[PDB]
Enzyme design. Structure first.
Site, short mmCIF file in Angstrom:
data_model
loop_
_atom_site.label_atom_id
_atom_site.label_comp_id
_atom_site.label_asym_id
_atom_site.label_seq_id
_atom_site.Cartn_x
_atom_site.Cartn_y
_atom_site.Cartn_z
N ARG A 180 34.51 33.62 -17.38
CA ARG A 180 33.49 34.06 -18.32
C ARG A 180 33.85 33.76 -19.77
NH1 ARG A 180 33.96 38.90 -15.10
NH2 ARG A 180 32.20 39.19 -13.64
N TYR A 229 39.81 32.35 4.49
CA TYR A 229 40.05 33.33 3.43
C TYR A 229 38.79 34.19 3.22
CZ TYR A 229 42.53 34.86 -0.86
OH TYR A 229 43.21 35.57 -1.82
N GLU A 246 53.21 45.48 -4.13
CA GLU A 246 52.81 44.49 -3.13
C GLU A 246 53.74 43.28 -3.17
OE1 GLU A 246 48.62 43.95 -2.72
OE2 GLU A 246 48.78 41.82 -2.22
N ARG A 282 51.70 42.56 -7.64
CA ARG A 282 50.92 43.56 -8.36
C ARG A 282 51.27 44.99 -7.94
NH1 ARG A 282 45.96 40.82 -5.24
NH2 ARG A 282 46.20 41.87 -3.22
N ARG A 333 50.34 33.71 5.16
CA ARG A 333 51.10 34.57 4.27
C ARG A 333 50.94 36.01 4.74
NH1 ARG A 333 55.06 32.77 1.22
NH2 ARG A 333 54.59 34.27 -0.45
N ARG A 343 37.85 32.18 -6.68
CA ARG A 343 37.52 33.54 -6.28
C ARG A 343 37.40 34.39 -7.53
NH1 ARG A 343 38.63 35.90 -1.46
NH2 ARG A 343 39.91 37.51 -2.47
N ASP A 400 36.49 37.73 2.80
CA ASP A 400 36.44 39.11 2.32
C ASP A 400 35.62 39.95 3.28
OD1 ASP A 400 38.03 38.73 0.07
OD2 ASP A 400 36.32 38.21 -1.21
C1 LIG Z 1 45.81 42.61 0.48
C2 LIG Z 1 44.29 42.33 0.81
C3 LIG Z 1 43.30 42.84 -0.02
C4 LIG Z 1 41.95 42.61 0.26
N1 LIG Z 1 41.03 43.13 -0.57
C5 LIG Z 1 39.71 42.93 -0.34
C6 LIG Z 1 38.71 43.50 -1.26
O1 LIG Z 1 39.08 44.14 -2.23
N2 LIG Z 1 37.34 43.29 -1.02
C7 LIG Z 1 36.92 42.53 0.11
O2 LIG Z 1 35.74 42.38 0.32
N3 LIG Z 1 37.91 41.98 1.02
C8 LIG Z 1 39.31 42.18 0.77
N4 LIG Z 1 40.27 41.67 1.61
C9 LIG Z 1 39.89 40.91 2.74
C10 LIG Z 1 39.47 41.73 4.04
O3 LIG Z 1 40.44 42.73 4.28
C11 LIG Z 1 39.12 41.00 5.35
O4 LIG Z 1 37.95 40.34 5.22
C12 LIG Z 1 38.97 41.98 6.44
O5 LIG Z 1 40.28 42.48 6.95
C13 LIG Z 1 38.09 41.49 7.61
O6 LIG Z 1 38.41 41.92 8.93
P1 LIG Z 1 38.48 40.86 10.05
O7 LIG Z 1 37.32 41.49 10.94
O8 LIG Z 1 38.41 39.33 9.66
O9 LIG Z 1 39.68 41.42 10.97
P2 LIG Z 1 41.12 41.84 10.35
O10 LIG Z 1 40.78 43.23 9.80
O11 LIG Z 1 41.91 40.81 9.45
O12 LIG Z 1 41.86 42.51 11.60
C14 LIG Z 1 41.28 42.52 12.85
C15 LIG Z 1 42.09 43.18 13.99
O13 LIG Z 1 42.35 42.35 15.10
C16 LIG Z 1 43.36 43.01 15.76
N5 LIG Z 1 43.99 42.14 16.68
C17 LIG Z 1 44.52 40.94 16.41
N6 LIG Z 1 45.03 40.41 17.54
C18 LIG Z 1 44.81 41.28 18.53
C19 LIG Z 1 45.11 41.28 19.89
N7 LIG Z 1 45.75 40.21 20.46
N8 LIG Z 1 44.75 42.33 20.65
C20 LIG Z 1 44.11 43.38 20.09
N9 LIG Z 1 43.82 43.42 18.79
C21 LIG Z 1 44.16 42.38 17.99
C22 LIG Z 1 44.28 43.50 14.63
O14 LIG Z 1 44.94 44.69 15.07
C23 LIG Z 1 43.43 43.67 13.54
O15 LIG Z 1 43.41 45.03 13.27
C24 LIG Z 1 41.59 41.88 1.35
C25 LIG Z 1 42.58 41.36 2.20
C26 LIG Z 1 43.93 41.59 1.92
C27 LIG Z 1 44.98 41.03 2.81
O1 LIG Z 2 46.39 36.99 -11.76
C1 LIG Z 2 46.11 36.18 -10.91
C2 LIG Z 2 45.21 36.47 -9.94
C3 LIG Z 2 44.95 35.51 -9.03
N1 LIG Z 2 45.54 34.34 -9.08
C4 LIG Z 2 45.28 33.30 -8.11
O2 LIG Z 2 44.05 33.45 -7.45
C5 LIG Z 2 44.24 33.63 -6.07
C6 LIG Z 2 43.27 34.64 -5.50
O3 LIG Z 2 43.26 35.85 -6.20
P1 LIG Z 2 42.70 37.17 -5.68
O4 LIG Z 2 42.68 38.06 -6.77
O5 LIG Z 2 41.32 37.04 -5.03
O6 LIG Z 2 43.85 37.46 -4.66
P2 LIG Z 2 43.65 38.39 -3.44
O7 LIG Z 2 44.95 39.12 -3.08
O8 LIG Z 2 43.04 37.74 -2.36
O9 LIG Z 2 42.65 39.35 -4.00
C7 LIG Z 2 42.93 40.73 -3.97
O10 LIG Z 2 43.58 41.11 -5.20
C8 LIG Z 2 43.32 42.54 -5.44
C9 LIG Z 2 43.28 42.93 -6.91
O11 LIG Z 2 42.03 43.46 -7.27
C10 LIG Z 2 43.59 41.79 -7.82
O12 LIG Z 2 44.98 41.90 -8.14
C11 LIG Z 2 42.11 42.92 -4.58
F1 LIG Z 2 41.17 43.64 -5.12
F2 LIG Z 2 42.65 43.60 -3.57
C12 LIG Z 2 41.63 41.55 -4.06
F3 LIG Z 2 40.76 40.97 -4.87
F4 LIG Z 2 41.13 41.63 -2.84
C13 LIG Z 2 45.68 34.03 -5.93
O13 LIG Z 2 46.20 33.62 -4.70
C14 LIG Z 2 46.34 33.33 -7.05
O14 LIG Z 2 46.74 32.04 -6.65
C15 LIG Z 2 46.40 34.12 -10.04
O15 LIG Z 2 46.98 33.06 -10.15
N2 LIG Z 2 46.68 35.02 -10.94
#
Ligand SMILES: Cc1cc2nc3c(=O)[nH]c(=O)nc-3n(C[C@H](O)[C@H](O)[C@H](O)COP(=O)(O)OP(=O)(O)OC[C@H]3O[C@@H](n4cnc5c(N)ncnc54)[C@H](O)[C@@H]3O)c2cc1C
Ligand SMILES: O=c1ccn([C@@H]2O[C@H](COP(=O)(O)OP(=O)(O)O[C@H]3O[C@@H]([C@H](O)CO)C(F)(F)C3(F)F)[C@@H](O)[C@H]2O)c(=O)[nH]1
Ligand SMILES: Cc1cc2nc3c(=O)[nH]c(=O)nc-3n(C[C@H](O)[C@H](O)[C@H](O)COP(=O)(O)OP(=O)(O)OC[C@H]3O[C@@H](n4cnc5c(N)ncnc54)[C@H](O)[C@@H]3O)c2cc1C
Ligand SMILES: O=c1ccn([C@@H]2O[C@H](COP(=O)(O)OP(=O)(O)O[C@H]3O[C@@H]([C@H](O)CO)C(F)(F)C3(F)F)[C@@H](O)[C@H]2O)c(=O)[nH]1
Lengths: 391, 391
Positions: free
Chosen positions: A180, A362, A311, A288, A257, A176, A364
């Site tokens: 570079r 996994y 976090e 982080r 997780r 992910r 986004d």
């Molecule tokens: C810490 C973190 C950082 C992230 N950062 C990025 C990023 O920087 N850029 C990026 O592109 N992606 C990022 N992602 C990933 C991204 O958030 C997910 O792709 C996104 O949440 C997609 O939404 P989803 O539609 O798969 O549903 P989700 O948003 O995972 O949630 C869907 C909804 O279903 C609902 N639901 C579940 N079960 C039920 C039920 N039984 N009844 C009613 N409602 C229910 C929940 O309430 C939930 O709100 C990040 C994820 C995490 C965890």
């Molecule tokens: O420093 C790092 C960063 C990532 N990793 C590994 O790479 C895996 C994925 O990393 P990734 O950055 O995409 O983790 P994520 O929480 O899904 O991504 C999230 O991390 C945030 C932030 O910029 C970066 O700190 C974010 F923007 F929210 C994200 F990219 F969505 C992670 O699980 C680790 O195993 C490291 O080992 N070390």
């Protein structure tokens, strides 16, 4: 007779994309059921009272994509800022450029390496495994950045984030991150990138704005599906909740997780001078820290206060909300089973499965939206419009 | 009777801006006289044959401005890319983040400093002088970044670039660089920034494209002004050449700095992994190195070759082309004299003075364009259109 044309479970980007496309392009009534008190899933944002700064309540959300069609679609509901996401890494009391680049290399190894010299150095340190033969996270990471860098920036972070042997974690997790041999420290490598100008909640509310879309917050699908579905028997169901939870974990518990956050307003204007600071050392409990003022520099927030968020990562319990699919060999095996049960549910009661949770993927935001568009184009629309079966 | 309505000397951004505004907004015929074989002055770019990469022939040119009116004006002639300029600094065999930020501080001082800790550290090292009382470059630099950082990244570079005591150089020179206590390593701090999408020459050629504008390359104004002006006696003259050269250096020689470049195509794909690398150590003759492929990453150049350019600085001779005004006390004194002679020339033969060279001012592209717009609005247009005298 028929109240709704489609039920959608979950108001995340997948759910809303599905709900929007169906209602807007097919002129159909869609009911969206959300368990949370708000829409948008984990993308929901909220302004912190004291400072006014927008806080991504469920962890930092940065939008990015190389898909032109997704980019054009999302821009129908929001503007995007000029923001390009960058991450710094804290290791042994020093802040490092990140990820793999000439910045990280020259800092960690003490002297400037040319692009050519950098490629040679890493090739030596990545000798124990070739990238093509990489099976897991540990092997793939070392094959891309070398063992010394893996030791200092990956092994520790991965331990706190997963608490799982890196030899059991998928290689897709570490890929992910861009690798570079330039000074480009952009954390992503997509064509299009930015933050929603008016915030995530505004964006989300614009997708669900259509009058043919009804969203019911504070509602679990399992509580009301008995009552709802006979009201619209022909209506399919798009489910985006946890896949294993749907079948009452009857095949076993998928490894997830979950995350816990600590939000703190500080009496100073600037905590770390950057949006996200990773903590790679095990001597600290959090993975982080986010400082949300740096997400939107185009806005001028007050300079005497600031909002930070630590976090914390752990295994998801039966009452927890799942954030990440772990996807070990055992997990993938169990997933294969639920795939079959899900496939059966599609043919027995027209129930579809999508999204990060609904597919144990996994994903986004852009991947989730692209996935939803594909389900609409190839499955949902032909069914709702042309009667075609869902299989 | 009257052939032209205005003579313009020099086809740089000032000259072209003037020429474009007059011809396009007042419907007047403008003759532009250029001594060089090309238009655009030092902004002229040219694709290198082997690689196809655009080379800024007279040193790296990066456009940036906070002036909304300038931004809107320049976009009439060219698109701009997403590029945000960044510079790295080479010191004692290590590549440093630059300019003043938490990156530079944490690298040079060996450990991570918080924004607050960074402010305290620099305040201690900047104790010998307060910023308000800063008279010259040396004092102002130390007051902003401290003496240790001044010693390592400013004192040496300034020596090679100016070969003048930093106590005699203007403080404005060092304040061109932003001073931050974040990890923001953007070399500029303007609202709008980017590179011309189709290159600088295309941009320039679009400004001089109008049919009422004639540009004569390979023509010195002094060679032909005797012949031209009686052809259009009422026509004013906008001069953007060297101010002291105009009056045959009759009051003395203004201090200028000129540049020599070495362009080399290398059989490798990447030389330094970034657009501009500064060289702050005196053990190397050049001030910096440009690698032009990194200016336009959105274009996909070949990966087996690359163009680099080493920049050398020295005093401008009588036959040299002046690039930088030195502006010492002696220079400012001499300038005051030429200002008076220039002021006299305006009243005696309607000759205006503008641009970097014509005013002995350390001007950037946006400042030069803004200056030209002001001269048009407040001086030229009322004269050409409403008969108002130039004073
Ligand atoms: C810490 C973190 C950082 C992230 N950062 C990025 C990023 O920087 N850029 C990026 O592109 N992606 C990022 N992602 C990933 C991204 O958030 C997910 O792709 C996104 O949440 C997609 O939404 P989803 O539609 O798969 O549903 P989700 O948003 O995972 O949630 C869907 C909804 O279903 C609902 N639901 C579940 N079960 C039920 C039920 N039984 N009844 C009613 N409602 C229910 C929940 O309430 C939930 O709100 C990040 C994820 C995490 C965890
Ligand atoms: O420093 C790092 C960063 C990532 N990793 C590994 O790479 C895996 C994925 O990393 P990734 O950055 O995409 O983790 P994520 O929480 O899904 O991504 C999230 O991390 C945030 C932030 O910029 C970066 O700190 C974010 F923007 F929210 C994200 F990219 F969505 C992670 O699980 C680790 O195993 C490291 O080992 N070390
Ligand atoms: C190495 C370097 C890097 C720079 N980088 C940037 C940057 O990144 N961003 C930025 O905004 N600015 C940058 N600048 C500054 C910028 O280039 C100037 O502002 C710009 O050249 C403005 O043009 P000017 O109209 O003042 O005329 P100039 O372009 O300085 O030249 C005007 C023309 O007058 C002509 N001329 C002179 N005398 C005669 C004569 N007697 N007869 C006929 N023609 C004559 C010359 O041929 C010349 O071409 C940089 C400057 C240098 C030297
Ligand atoms: O590393 C540095 C950089 C600048 N300085 C001082 O600051 C003065 C002005 O610097 P500045 O960067 O604007 O010099 P300049 O050539 O006018 O600017 C040019 O430098 C180029 C590059 O990015 C930076 O290397 C550029 F983009 F072309 C530029 F900004 F136009 C310079 O004369 C030095 O005395 C240092 O001491 N050390």
């Amino acid at each position: 007779t028929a109240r709704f044309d489609l039920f959608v479970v979950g108001s995340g980007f997948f759910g809303l994309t599905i709900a929007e496309r169906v209602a807007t392009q097919l002129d159909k009534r869609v009911l969206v059921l959300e368990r949370r008190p708000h829409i948008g899933g984990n993308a929901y944002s909220e302004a912190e009272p004291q400072t006014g700064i927008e806080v991504h309540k469920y962890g930092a959300h940065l939008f990015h994509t190389s898909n032109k069609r997704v980019w054009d679609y999302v821009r129908q509901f929001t503007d995007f800022t000029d923001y390009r996401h960058r991450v710094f890494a804290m290791h042994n009391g020093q802040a490092y450029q990140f990820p793999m680049g000439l910045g990280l290399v020259s800092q960690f190894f003490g002297k400037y390496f040319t692009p050519e010299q950098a490629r040679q150095l890493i090739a030596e340190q990545a000798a124990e495994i070739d990238t093509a033969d990489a099976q897991n996270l540990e092997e793939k990471a070392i094959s891309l950045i070398g063992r010394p860098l893996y030791e200092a920036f990956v092994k520790g972070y991965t331990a706190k984030q997963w608490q799982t042997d890196p030899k059991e974690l998928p290689a897709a997790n570490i890929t992910r991150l861009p690798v570079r041999y330039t000074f480009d420290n952009r954390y992503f490598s997509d064509t299009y990138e930015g933050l929603p100008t008016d915030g995530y909640t505004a964006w989300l509310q614009n997708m669900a704005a259509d009058h043919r879309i009804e969203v019911r917050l504070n509602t679990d699908w399992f509580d009301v599906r008995g009552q709802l579905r006979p009201g619209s028997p022909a209506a399919p169901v798009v489910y985006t909740g946890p896949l294993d939870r749907y079948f009452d974990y009857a095949e076993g518990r998928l490894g997830w997780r979950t995350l816990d956050f600590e939000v703190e307003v500080l009496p100073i204007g600037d905590f770390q001078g950057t949006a996200v600071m990773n903590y790679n050392d095990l001597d600290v409990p959090y993975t982080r820290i986010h400082e949300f003022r740096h997400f939107h520099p185009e806005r001028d927030y007050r300079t005497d206060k600031t909002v930070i968020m630590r976090e914390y990562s752990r295994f998801a319990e039966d009452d927890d909300e799942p954030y990440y699919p772990i996807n070990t060999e055992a997990d993938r095996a169990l997933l294969a089973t639920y795939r079959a049960r899900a496939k059966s549910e599609t043919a027995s009661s027209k129930v579809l499965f999508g999204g990060r949770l609904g597919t144990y993927q996994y994903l986004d935001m852009h991947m989730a939206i692209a996935s939803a568009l594909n389900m609409y184009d190839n499955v949902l629309a032909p069914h709702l419009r042309d009667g075609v079966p869902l299989l």
